[PDB]
Amino acid sequence: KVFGRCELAAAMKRHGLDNYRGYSLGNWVCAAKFESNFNTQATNRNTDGSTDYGILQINSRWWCNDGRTPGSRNLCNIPCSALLSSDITASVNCAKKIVSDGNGMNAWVAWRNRCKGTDVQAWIRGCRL
Ligand SMILES: [Cl-]
Ligand SMILES: [Cl-]
């Protein structure tokens, strides 16, 4: 599923991400825009053989099992395919564990490089939330 901006903002809010660990909703929307262009089915392979999955490009090295990332951990205890669902619930619950692990949203390179220190509120401007 390819979300619209306000559609995704509302789904993220309902799943509890607005100000989760201090990150306003616009951060999460910004991150999803640049990680996946709002596409739940996005996958991208990394040089180390791991793969990033879903709307928030969660990495199989640490967070989910794809059966092909040797010596990886599965810290969200889910198959990575669950992160590609049109229901963002699994991606959000795993994202909550990632952002809580000490490095906050710097875990997402696109957020660090394209969202951090910008007007992220602009990403939810005009949405009925
Ligand atoms: Cl915001
Ligand atoms: Cl980047």
Swiss-Prot record:
Binding positions for substrate per the UniProt entry: 101
UniProt-listed GO biological process terms: cell wall macromolecule catabolic process; defense response to bacterium; defense response to Gram-negative bacterium; defense response to Gram-positive bacterium; killing of cells of another organism
Catalytic activity: Hydrolysis of (1->4)-beta-linkages between N-acetylmuramic acid and N-acetyl-D-glucosamine residues in a peptidoglycan and between N-acetyl-D-glucosamine residues in chitodextrins
EC number assigned by the record: 3.2.1.17
Annotated active site: 35, 52
InterPro entries, A to Z: Glyco_hydro_22 (IPR001916), Glyco_hydro_22_CS (IPR019799), Glyco_hydro_22_lys (IPR000974), Lysozyme-like_dom_sf (IPR023346)
GO terms of molecular function: beta-N-acetylglucosaminidase activity; identical protein binding; lysozyme activity
Keyword Glycosyltransferase listed: no
Keywords assigned by UniProt, alphabetized: Allergen, Antimicrobial, Bacteriolytic enzyme, Disulfide bond, Glycosidase, Hydrolase, Secreted, Signal
Classification via SUPFAM superfamilies: Lysozyme-like (SSF53955)
CC per GO annotation: cytoplasm; endoplasmic reticulum; extracellular space
Residue ranges annotated for the C-type lysozyme domain, each copy included: 1-129
Disulphide-bridged cysteine pairs: 6-127, 30-115, 64-80, 76-94
Tissue specificity remark: In the egg white and polymorphonuclear leukocytes.
CDD domains: LYZ_C
Location in or out of the cell: Secreted
Physiological role: Lysozymes have primarily a bacteriolytic function; those in tissues and body fluids are associated with the monocyte-macrophage system and enhance the activity of immunoagents. Has bacteriolytic activity against M.luteus.
Something else known: Lysozyme C is capable of both hydrolysis and transglycosylation; it also shows a slight esterase activity. It acts rapidly on both peptide-substituted and unsubstituted peptidoglycan, and slowly on chitin oligosaccharides.
Subunit-level organization: Monomer.
Family: Belongs to the glycosyl hydrolase 22 family.
Name of the featured protein: Lysozyme C
